[PDB]
Amino acid sequence: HMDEQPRSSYDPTFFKTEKGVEGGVTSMYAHLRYIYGQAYYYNSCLTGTDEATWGWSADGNFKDADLSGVGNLTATTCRSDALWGTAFSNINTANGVIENGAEVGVNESLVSEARFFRAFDYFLLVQTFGGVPLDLGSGELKFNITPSRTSVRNTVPEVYTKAIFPDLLTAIENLPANPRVTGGVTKTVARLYLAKAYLTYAWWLKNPNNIPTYPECQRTDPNGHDAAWYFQQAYDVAVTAIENPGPFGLQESFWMVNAGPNDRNMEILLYADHTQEDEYYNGGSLSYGAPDNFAGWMMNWNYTDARSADNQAVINRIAEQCYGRPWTRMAPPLGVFTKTFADKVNDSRYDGTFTTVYRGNWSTAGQNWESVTNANGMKVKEREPIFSFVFQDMDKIDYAGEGSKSNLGAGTLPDRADWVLGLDAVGRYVYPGLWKLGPYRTDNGSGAGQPNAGSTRPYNIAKFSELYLVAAEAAVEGAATQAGKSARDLVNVLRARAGRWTYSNAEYKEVDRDFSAEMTAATPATIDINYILDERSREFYGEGYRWFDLVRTQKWNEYADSYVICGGKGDHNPQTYSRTIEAFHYLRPIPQGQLDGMEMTEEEKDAYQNPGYRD
16 A cells, blocks of 8 residues: 555645644654664665675565575565655645645644655655655645555656755745754754755766666756756755754764763754654543664674673673664674774774673672673673673684683683674674664663663654765765865864764773864865765764665665675674675665555556566
8 A cells, every 4th residue: 555544535624724734743753753763674774785784683674685695675575665655644644734734824834844744755765766656646746535546656856856845945944943842843954854855866867877767767857957056055055054053063972972861962853752652542532552663673682692601691681772682683794893983093983883892780680799700710790891892902812712601702812801702703693782772761770671672762863963974975076165164174073073082882981082183184185975975884874874875876886795794603704795786776666565556457567666676
């Protein structure tokens, strides 16, 4: 199906009221929870890129997505499919809110939230699937009540020009500076997504590596401007946001951006609010009776395996950000450590991304051991390092001896009271957990909390930081820059920020370091797209940006054609795996469910489906 949500003949009249417009608008905030935090969609944004390959416990969902000869990516197996029905349901709702609310004069500040969300949804769809329908059964961008059995896909430029740009431009004029409600949309997030949309369209027009689009359409803009024009607008709009940020801004340190106690901070422009839940009512009377934020489980592993020299289970599964529930379904390739996060001394970001030092928490399991013995018969207290992923003396580790006793493929080092494994020995079972998406719960007490519950944390969708990297990318592709905001200046803002350490996760303590001078100096004299993409991986690793960024820039092949990783536990042999990423893979399949739901001939269905996925 296309529209999941049920529609009443009175809905258009409902949306001629302010309370109806609010109703619709708040369901739009809700729709974010079915995408952002959803683990299988999350997969579709990351696996098969440089940031993620399949993990030891991987399903078809993750294997099929890696495009590495261990699965099949088809119209039934791509987890792009979570986006389709969710986005179109929301879009239809937005269509109703917008045509009826605007017709009657319902406050445009509020209506423009729906304008934003409609653009937002279409921008995800257009990148993911190519051209998609603007007509849902009642005309272009019109509210549809009774679902149609037939659909027609518009072209990419039609979606950008007809739906995405005009909505965002209007939204920017009318949206408030400060959020109306929590996580609420503002001028700044509308500007961000407009700049991104212009940036993405500009690349689409330029089409340097000749990746086909579907439906068939020529590489020119109905609005009549060239790629350069769009690159310039991307720059200008991003920069206008930076200069008029309302309440938003960068945190002092990169740790503060994704640290649990600082969720909902003013670097976050938009998020899915996973605390907010649904209240059922039956015929006016309360009835007892949400989707989960379980994306953080994918790039998290069985640290609970960790043992002492006396084979004691020293790490309990608990609801803390460094620990949390593991599904071992996605793993970081070694390129992440050797290329992306090369610098770990001057760069907060590696440490503000991965949990590297795993400590004992055994009293959460009801144990009362003062100390325990492991790692050359050394005593280790609670909350002290048991197992560390290291990047220093990697070629000295002794995996041959007592490291066996860890139940981790781990080894030892001299005068070192902790098990240890180097980043060149990372595998599909044992890898640094993704700390960004770990759970955060104040109500754990002295116990484990509820570690198998979905995360209650916001899932962060849009960040003030990205503005800098959107403008910088536009600058690299030829846009005319303003004084103090060259490509190099813009990149250096985020890099200077990255050199400021406020807290070390590895060391589990406050800290005071400023390596911003060093970071600024090590930035290349001139900036290429490769560097933008590396910075994007550093700032946004594992958050679900990667597939979009590599497809826009057409670097997906260059960055993902091969990855490097070791095997299961006790396998420290780094093997190179090669992917087969064809040009038609740059568009995801239309989900088979949509095709099956339509009254069409097999010929019409073949034509509806993107090339490569028709058999």
